[PDB]
Design a protein around this nucleic acid. Sequence first.
RNA 1: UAAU
RNA 2: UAAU
Lengths: 146, 152
Amino acid sequence: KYLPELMAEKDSLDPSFTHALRLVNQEIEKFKYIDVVINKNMKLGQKVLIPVKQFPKFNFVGKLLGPRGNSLKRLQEETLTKMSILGKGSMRDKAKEEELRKSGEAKYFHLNDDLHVLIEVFAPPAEAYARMGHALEEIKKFLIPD
Amino acid sequence: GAMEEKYLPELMAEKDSLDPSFTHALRLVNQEIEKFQKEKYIDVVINKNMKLGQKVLIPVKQFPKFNFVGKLLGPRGNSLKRLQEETLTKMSILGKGSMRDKAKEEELRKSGEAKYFHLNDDLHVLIEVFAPPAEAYARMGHALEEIKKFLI
RNA sequence: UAAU
RNA sequence: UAAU
């Protein structure tokens, strides 16, 4: 009974209610402890603020990515993590970025957030926490100007 | 944060202009406004102490009466004290099976019911670390390696 | 093996 | 410096 009401609203809501539509679709689409013997891969995620407020003119994203992205790819490979630069100011063109933000797609919803690096690890527990610790130490050398 | 600068006003403007016959969308917009108006992001310039906790299952079902709790603690609890000190964690044995006497162990999360609902969950070890971020993850990984030696 |  |  409840999902058919949600779908009627999805279909009848005016497009300009981008946030309501997102919350409705999200609600529609909705239709543990670590066991150390079998030691299965677990997901760890951690967001790290880029200190833009305190360094408003430093080019953190450009330093993080490098030419053609190669600096961030090499840092990903040598830390065995995935790193995503997300949040306000994470794109090159701020006017383009703002239009994507306004589109309401979940793919661009992170643009409402503060500029951060999302570090994600998938590994057995002891190794996942170790990897994340090493990634945090290396990522400092990029986020703190010198 | 950029949420309080543009997301929240936007939510607010939608809630004010939504036709209230959309009772689900209006409900969900209102709940989302509520969620935002009431921990996750590392500030790596300040690098302040951060909390990390991880619960580690004691594998009672595969090993139904190997005495894990006894091996973890040792005499007067010294072996668990060693392990916390060497890893720089706090470690708490919790779940069902945690207390020495099974009889009362049932009654304590009947009635009273303030601090003891960890006795509705499986038996497990809670590992807690408090340290700057890179060190805190490093410490948890080390405590996870060290503690395997007690769960096999 | 019974700790905080 | 613009990756995913």
